Design a binder for this molecule. Structure first.
Ligand SMILES: C[C@@H]1CC[C@@]2(OC1)O[C@H]1[C@@H](O)[C@H]3[C@@H]4CC[C@H]5C[C@@H](O[C@@H]6O[C@H](CO)[C@H](O[C@@H]7O[C@H](CO)[C@@H](O)[C@H](O[C@@H]8OC[C@@H](O)[C@H](O)[C@H]8O)[C@H]7O[C@@H]7O[C@H](CO)[C@H](O)[C@H](O[C@@H]8O[C@H](CO)[C@@H](O)[C@H](O)[C@H]8O)[C@H]7O)[C@H](O)[C@H]6O)[C@H](O)C[C@]5(C)[C@H]4CC[C@]3(C)[C@H]1[C@@H]2C
Ligand SMILES: C[C@@H]1CC[C@@]2(OC1)O[C@H]1[C@@H](O)[C@H]3[C@@H]4CC[C@H]5C[C@@H](O[C@@H]6O[C@H](CO)[C@H](O[C@@H]7O[C@H](CO)[C@@H](O)[C@H](O[C@@H]8OC[C@@H](O)[C@H](O)[C@H]8O)[C@H]7O[C@@H]7O[C@H](CO)[C@H](O)[C@H](O[C@@H]8O[C@H](CO)[C@@H](O)[C@H](O)[C@H]8O)[C@H]7O)[C@H](O)[C@H]6O)[C@H](O)C[C@]5(C)[C@H]4CC[C@]3(C)[C@H]1[C@@H]2C
Ligand SMILES: *[C@@H]1O[C@H](CO)[C@@H](O[C@@H]2O[C@H](CO)[C@@H](O[C@@H]3O[C@H](CO[C@H]4O[C@H](CO)[C@@H](O)[C@H](O)[C@@H]4O)[C@@H](O)[C@H](O[C@H]4O[C@H](CO)[C@@H](O)[C@H](O)[C@@H]4O[C@H]4O[C@H](CO)[C@@H](O)[C@H](O)[C@@H]4O[C@H]4O[C@H](CO)[C@@H](O)[C@H](O)[C@@H]4O)[C@@H]3O)[C@H](O)[C@H]2NC(C)=O)[C@H](O)[C@H]1NC(C)=O
Ligand SMILES: CC(C)=CCC/C(C)=C/CC/C(C)=C/CC/C(C)=C/CC/C(C)=C/CC/C(C)=C/CC/C(C)=C/CC/C(C)=C/CC/C(C)=C/C=C/C(C)=C/CC[C@@H](C)CCOP(=O)(O)O
Ligand SMILES: CCCCCCCC/C=C\CCCCCCCC(=O)OC[C@H](COP(=O)(O)OCCN)OC(=O)CCCCCCC/C=C\CCCCCCCC
Ligand SMILES: CCCCCCCC/C=C\CCCCCCCC(=O)OC[C@H](COP(=O)(O)OCCN)OC(=O)CCCCCCC/C=C\CCCCCCCC
Ligand SMILES: CCCCCCCC/C=C\CCCCCCCC(=O)OC[C@H](COP(=O)(O)OCCN)OC(=O)CCCCCCC/C=C\CCCCCCCC
Ligand SMILES: [Mg+2]
Lengths: 35, 40, 160, 108, 111
């Protein structure tokens, strides 16, 4: 079974990936969209 | 007593005027829907 | 989908990212908790989404969905009183602010007329939505809006 | 007040003559009111409301049908921005045959 | 109470009383005549009659739309006679799928 430290690292990596892709999307939409 | 063992809504005599209203509203609504798409 | 209404879609993903990992909502939805709130917040959001979608557009089909998910929340949790006392407050605040339109009438009257009779079908709720003081606010606003629409007609044919 | 009534009666009675399908609505709303009154009269004459769920099922099916008819009339007189005069009917039908099922389940 | 104890019976509560049949029959007749009056007002008095009727394929879509609208109310009436909820759900799902398509086709074609 997966350990506890491995699960902690997995959760942190999922959160970092999510918070980075969200910012990438927002920074693409702010420029590419007609303002 | 379970819900299925209470006396039905038509066996009672006090509530024969509350089912006529529902049946009349439903019939009138059907006829209205029919006549709405068949009128200028 | 609810923040996609208040602002652009780009500002909704952030909200999702917030509500996915936040300890105030994780505290009551941990892997072992099997309480009502586990399912009672999702619906809390979904109903509100439809209500906005119904109040912003004015359609009837977006208020019947709000009524159905409010019946599902009534069945799933005893905190439906919050919605029953919050949606009428929104409608009332829009009434006295001077922003009454022909969309509030349809949206709110459809929502109430379906949601109340649907929530009466839960044997635990019973006849409370017409007997208890909590729900009375909703009922009051119902009557109030029935007056305001007629008043609007008078404005249509009377000098200001 | 006499002038207001005089100038509103003929206006309404000309509007209802220009559009025929605005006479289907109101003469169907009006009679609904009567039904409600009749039921209330009954509960007044028989002062015991034994099947109170039946009374509610017979009164809500009038109130929540009057309100849907009124919403349809408002949305037909001058349509809403996004939705056309043909969604105004295919949504009223859905809401009405959901309310009918709810009020048939209530009374049993 | 070494020897014997007195007998005990349970005194039930009186059941709520129904009403006499003639009053209910009168109030049913009143609603029936009111509905008939509404129908007569629609047909003749208000001059709101069947001006245009769909023909051909649009008439077949019209028959389908009426069939859907009436079938849902037949389903609800049959469910009001002690039919299982699951059966009602299946009978409604087997009728909405063709009925939705036919009704949308009619409402887009006719307008
Ligand atoms: C889009 C989805 C795909 C599926 C998934 O989510 C996103 O991504 C998968 C991701 O790749 C993960 C795995 C990555 C590889 C990891 C490998 C790790 O193996 C360990 O197990 C030791 C046991 O002896 C081995 O030695 C050594 O190799 C290592 O110490 C295991 O302990 C955890 C592990 C398997 C992870 C478990 C959880 C996942 C499977 C994640 C999850 C299902
Ligand atoms: C305008 C505002 C304010 C005024 C108001 O409207 C809103 O009008 C008031 C109205 O007067 C209402 C009261 C009128 C009398 C009502 C009587 C009613 O009794 C009901 O109680 C149910 C309890 O199960 C019965 O169900 C079964 O009860 C069995 C007996 O126990 C029968 O047997 C069986 O058949 C019935 O089925 C049901 O059959 C029965 O009828 C009670 O449950 C609610 C009740 C007390 C009402 C509470 C809410 C109000 C006060 C309404 C409300 C304040
Ligand atoms: C929550 O939990 C709590 C605790 O578990 C529950 O509380 C219990 O509830 C019980 C039922 O309500 C209750 O039992 C009754 O207590 C009464 C208390 O009376 C006190 O005063 C008398 C003197 O007046 C004392 O003698 C007595 O000891 C007490 O101190 C009793 O009076 C009741 O007795 C009657 O019922 C029992 C049981 O059937 C009979 O044996 C007894 O002889 C009495 O019977 C008469 O009344 C019944 C009413 O149905 C008739 O059916 C019966 O035929 C008898 O009728 C004669 O008398 C009546 C009245 O005078 C007359 O009209 C008729 O013509 C006949 O002459 C009974 O014992 C528990 O005490 C109570 N416990 C506690 C700790 O409070 C609570 O219910 C729970 N809540 C819920 C919602 O369930
Ligand atoms: C006849 C026919 C067929 C048709 C005719 C036409 C027709 C359409 C007719 C329709 C019917 C009519 C006409 C009706 C008429 C009635 C009228 C005209 C009335 C007058 C208007 C007024 C007067 C308005 C003004 C509002 C008004 C009263 C205000 C006063 C009342 C009031 C303010 C009350 C209290 C307010 C209050 C308490 C507010 C806040 C409460 C909140 C927000 C509570 C929330 C608490 C929470 C969050 C609870 C959650 C619980 C969980 C956390 C825990 C549950 O436990 P678990 O079991 O573990 O889940
Ligand atoms: C699909 C991707 C396939 C990945 C294959 C790698 C799986 C793996 O190696 O995990 C092993 C590991 C241990 O296996 P053993 O019990 O030791 O069995 C040994 C017998 N050989 O399996 C686990 O227990 C992992 C437990 C589940 C992971 C928990 C995190 C899950 C996160 C949810 C993601 C869902 C979001 C997607 C939408
Ligand atoms: C008695 C019931 C009869 C009601 C049928 C007639 C109702 C009526 O006249 O409604 C008209 C009126 C105006 O609608 P518009 O399309 O916006 O007008 C166009 C130009 N402003 O609409 C309404 O009044 C809707 C609300 C009616 C509530 C009636 C309750 C009165 C309570 C006292
Ligand atoms: C058409 C679509 C309309 C859908 C709108 C929903 C609003 C109606 C709510 C009432 C329906 C409740 C229900 O279906 O249960 C029926 C049930 C069985 O009746 P029968 O004995 O089979 O037949 C009786 C014949 N006289 O009757 C009851 O006693 C129900 C009592 C309270 C129902 C509790 C509601 C259950 C939970 C509802 C939400 C859960 C849905 C999750 C699915 C995913
Ligand atoms: Mg709890």
């Amino acid at each position: 079974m997966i350990s506890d430290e491995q699960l902690n690292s997995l959760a942190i990596t999922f959160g970092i990936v999510m918070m980075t892709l969200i910012v990438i999307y927002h920074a693409v939409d702010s420029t590419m969209s007609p303002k | 007593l379970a819900n299925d063992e209470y006396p039905r809504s038509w066996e009672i005599s006090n509530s024969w005027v509350y089912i006529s209203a529902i049946c009349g509203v439903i019939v009138a609504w059907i006829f209205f829907v029919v006549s709405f798409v068949t009128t200028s | 989908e609810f923040t996609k209404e208040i602002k652009d879609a780009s500002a909704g993903l952030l909200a999702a990212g917030f509500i996915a990992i936040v300890p105030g909502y994780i505290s009551r939805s941990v892997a072992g908790s099997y309480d009502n709130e586990a399912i009672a917040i999702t619906l809390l959001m979904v109903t509100f989404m439809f209500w906005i979608k119904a109040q912003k557009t004015g359609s009837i089909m977006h208020a019947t969905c709000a009524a159905l998910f409010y019946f599902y929340m009534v069945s799933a949790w005893g905190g439906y009183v919050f919605i029953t006392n919050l949606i009428p407050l929104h409608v009332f605040l829009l009434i006295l602010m001077g922003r009454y339109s022909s969309k509030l009438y349809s949206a709110y009257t459809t929502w109430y007329a379906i949601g109340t009779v649907a929530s009466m079908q839960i044997p635990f709720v019973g006849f409370l939505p017409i007997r208890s003081n909590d729900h009375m606010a909703a009922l009051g606003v119902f009557g109030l809006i029935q007056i305001v629409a007629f008043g609007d007609f008078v404005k249509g044919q009377i000098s200001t | 007040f006499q002038e207001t009534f005089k100038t509103s009666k003929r206006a309404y009675f000309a509007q209802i003559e220009k559009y025929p399908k605005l006479k289907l609505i109101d003469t169907f709303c009006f009679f609904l009111v009567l039904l409600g009154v009749i039921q209330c009269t009954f509960i007044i004459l028989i002062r015991d409301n034994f099947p109170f769920n039946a009374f509610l099922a017979g009164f809500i099916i009038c109130v929540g049908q009057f309100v849907l008819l009124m919403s349809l009339r408002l949305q037909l007189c001058n349509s809403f921005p996004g939705i056309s005069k043909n969604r105004a009917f295919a949504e009223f039908i859905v809401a009405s045959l959901i309310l009918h099922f709810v009020c048939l389940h209530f009374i049993n | 109470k070494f020897g014997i104890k007195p007998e005990i019976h349970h005194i039930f509560h009186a059941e709520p009383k129904r009403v006499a049949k003639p009053i209910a029959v009168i109030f049913v007749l009143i609603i029936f005549i009111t509905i008939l009056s509404l129908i007569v007002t629609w047909l003749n008095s208000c001059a709101a009659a069947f001006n245009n009727i769909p023909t051909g394929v649009t008439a077949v879509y019209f028959l389908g739309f009426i069939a859907t609208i009436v079938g849902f109310e037949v389903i609800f009436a049959r469910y009001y006679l002690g039919t299982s909820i699951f059966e009602t759900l299946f009978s409604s799902l087997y009728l909405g799928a063709p009925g939705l398509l036919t009704s949308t086709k009619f409402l887009r074609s006719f307008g």
